[PDB]
Design a binder for these strands. Sequence first.
RNA 1: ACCCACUCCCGACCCGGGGAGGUAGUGACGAAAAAUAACAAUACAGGACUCUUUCGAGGCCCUGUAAUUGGAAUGAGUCCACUUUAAAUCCUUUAACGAGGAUCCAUUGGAGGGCAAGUCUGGUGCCAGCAGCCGCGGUAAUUCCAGCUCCAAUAGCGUAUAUUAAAGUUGCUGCAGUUAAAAAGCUCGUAGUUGGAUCU
RNA 2: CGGGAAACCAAAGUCUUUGGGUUCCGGGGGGAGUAUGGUUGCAAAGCUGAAACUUAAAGGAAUUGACGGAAGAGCGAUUUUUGUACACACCGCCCGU
Lengths: 33, 180, 141, 56, 25
Amino acid sequence: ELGTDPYEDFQENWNTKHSSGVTRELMRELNGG
Amino acid sequence: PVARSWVCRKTYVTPRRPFEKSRLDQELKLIGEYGLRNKREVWRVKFTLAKIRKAARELLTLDEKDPRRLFEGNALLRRLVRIGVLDEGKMKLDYILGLKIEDFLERRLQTQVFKLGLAKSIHHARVLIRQRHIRVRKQVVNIPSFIVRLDSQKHIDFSLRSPYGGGRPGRVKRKNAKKG
Amino acid sequence: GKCRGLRTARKLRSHRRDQKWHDKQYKKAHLGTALKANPFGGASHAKGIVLEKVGVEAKQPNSAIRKCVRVQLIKNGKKITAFVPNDGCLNFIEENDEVLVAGFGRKGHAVGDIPGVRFKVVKVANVSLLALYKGKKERPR
Amino acid sequence: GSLARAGKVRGQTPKVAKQEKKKKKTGRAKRRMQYNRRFVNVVPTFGKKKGPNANS
Amino acid sequence: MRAKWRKKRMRRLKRKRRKMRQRSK
RNA sequence: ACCCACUCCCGACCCGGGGAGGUAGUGACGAAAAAUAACAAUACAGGACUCUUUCGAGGCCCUGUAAUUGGAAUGAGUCCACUUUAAAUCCUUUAACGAGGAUCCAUUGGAGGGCAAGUCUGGUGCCAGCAGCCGCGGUAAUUCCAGCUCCAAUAGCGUAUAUUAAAGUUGCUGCAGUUAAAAAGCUCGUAGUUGGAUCU
RNA sequence: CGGGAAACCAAAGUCUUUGGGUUCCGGGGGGAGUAUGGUUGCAAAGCUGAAACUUAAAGGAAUUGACGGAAGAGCGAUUUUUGUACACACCGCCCGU
Ligand SMILES: [Mg+2]
Ligand SMILES: [Mg+2]
Ligand SMILES: [Mg+2]
Ligand SMILES: [Mg+2]
Ligand SMILES: [Mg+2]
Ligand SMILES: [Mg+2]
Ligand SMILES: [Mg+2]
Ligand SMILES: [Mg+2]
Ligand SMILES: [Mg+2]
Ligand SMILES: [Mg+2]
Ligand SMILES: [Mg+2]
Ligand SMILES: [Mg+2]
Ligand SMILES: [Mg+2]
Ligand SMILES: [Mg+2]
Ligand SMILES: [Mg+2]
Ligand SMILES: [Mg+2]
Ligand SMILES: [Mg+2]
Ligand SMILES: [Mg+2]
Ligand SMILES: [Mg+2]
Ligand SMILES: [Mg+2]
Ligand SMILES: [Mg+2]
Ligand SMILES: [Mg+2]
Ligand SMILES: [Mg+2]
Ligand SMILES: [Mg+2]
Ligand SMILES: [Mg+2]
Ligand SMILES: [Mg+2]
Ligand SMILES: [Mg+2]
Ligand SMILES: [Mg+2]
Ligand SMILES: [Mg+2]
Ligand SMILES: [Mg+2]
């Protein structure tokens, strides 16, 4: 099941309250760390 | 005035960055592979290696014929070869810079008890050492961080008083035998 | 440009000594007016007697009522507003009580919404506020 | 302003008792568990790295 | 406030003080 | 609090004296070493290995997880004795007792970013509160009050304050001065600083 | 040519490949070129010149918009003229009683 998409979350919440979180998730999606 | 001495020093240095992912992973790998109690035991060996490297680097800026360089680099190389981190063919002053922390970690009594087959685990080796089952050539040593010299390598055994080394059985065996 | 002569040591040293006074922190540390104006007199902590309880309005864009106490120090008699940090700890302090006060963390500068407050309460009636908050010790009474 | 509302929320939260859990290991044993959990035991992944405390 | 007029106001206030804060007093 | 047993000093002295000094007591200022578990069988799960093309197959090996089982090892303690010492204490050495929830229970701070780690659930609703800074909280709070879980160091961990590095933000190494802070309105001039080639 | 945040500068070049000589002078924004002391002047004022306290930004150059009682190349954002201290965008911002 595909529940959370880091790309969509970053592109949507990059300017909202939860930006600093979603960015941190997107990096975990990209660099594997 | 008193007849006491106040000479003492710390044996470790804490890292500048408290939360660095790569450093945490490396130190945890070292702890897991060598059965260490905490991070401070890694930092102690790192500090020792740093001091040795600093001495070697200070001796490499002198002229090759300088008497102090010849006297002190020879002693440093002799000590490194004695403890077993260095080899006889690599007794130049440049090879000291090629030493790693695992080389010093391999010379502890805890890892040598495990590598010699006296224990079936590194943690079992630590437990055996701390419980007074291991002797070094005449003496019962219960310090896991004991650094084994080369000439002592052949002389690690169970203690004569140990239940494993031919001694009297322990508390649990005696109580269970008394039960039946 | 700067002078690079071989006999200009006096000039360089004198110029540096005179230009160090234009550093805010150096002048603050070496002038003595700040030490004279500091209510603690250079100490980390102090003891005082609670004159009363006050409520300070939080600066915009925040809206709140921060609970503080007006106290008077024992060694010099100066009056000070200290912050009582926790949820409901102001009910642990009574009037005419003796409190231990420390700095707020920014070396005499105000912290956060609270305007003009640079001190916080540590112990009340010789017991720490943390122990009272966690229910480890009770008020002596 | 009014000081009558001090302690309002902390005295409103319903009380919940902590449950009973088995004691945690200490010292070398805790580090052994962390080492076996983070590096020795790893499941195949498809690149979506998850944190230790991820939920939904 | 324009800096020129601020300076002029400061000067007038200082002159008023000087008249009030007489050296004889 | 104990003693001149050690180190030394004084005296007419090999003999006397010494809160000088030594020995204990209090002591998380600080520094060193170092426990809080280890193993085996089962019950599950992964890897290599082979045979089987696939369904598959195995004590055939290696590694992980269990308030599932089992019997081994120990010192923390209680405590004879010796040793230690002026007499003791402590450490060391040794009899006997001493571990399964081995209840003989590890804490201090955090979980938006800086910075390692949950937009999980229940309350509250710009209130109470958090927050070094940016910020959170006005009915779906990743930040408050809690439960669970998860991070960091660990017999230690937070806080306030002085100070060092970070600061090439005091710049000798090594900073700037058109517009971001900045070159005197202009010239003369004493002290200071600096001073062209040439002698085997 | 090379510099620089850029606007631009043959100097504002020959600077982490950092040293030709020398003078003055700056150290986040306010309080403030204010108070006080000294000194000069008939006066107006000139020179020297703080602290307590307060604040998380103020400021430079350039870009895209919005307003106006105006006519391959750049570190990078980015790629009708023009000005801007506006960007919740003139229904703006903002000064003093
Ligand atoms: Mg708010
Ligand atoms: Mg004596
Ligand atoms: Mg005598
Ligand atoms: Mg005494
Ligand atoms: Mg004494
Ligand atoms: Mg210590
Ligand atoms: Mg314990
Ligand atoms: Mg906790
Ligand atoms: Mg929480
Ligand atoms: Mg953080
Ligand atoms: Mg993180
Ligand atoms: Mg703010
Ligand atoms: Mg809710
Ligand atoms: Mg919620
Ligand atoms: Mg410094
Ligand atoms: Mg430096
Ligand atoms: Mg500074
Ligand atoms: Mg340099
Ligand atoms: Mg500068
Ligand atoms: Mg200017
Ligand atoms: Mg000029
Ligand atoms: Mg001259
Ligand atoms: Mg010459
Ligand atoms: Mg330079
Ligand atoms: Mg300034
Ligand atoms: Mg200031
Ligand atoms: Mg292009
Ligand atoms: Mg390009
Ligand atoms: Mg114009
Ligand atoms: Mg524009």
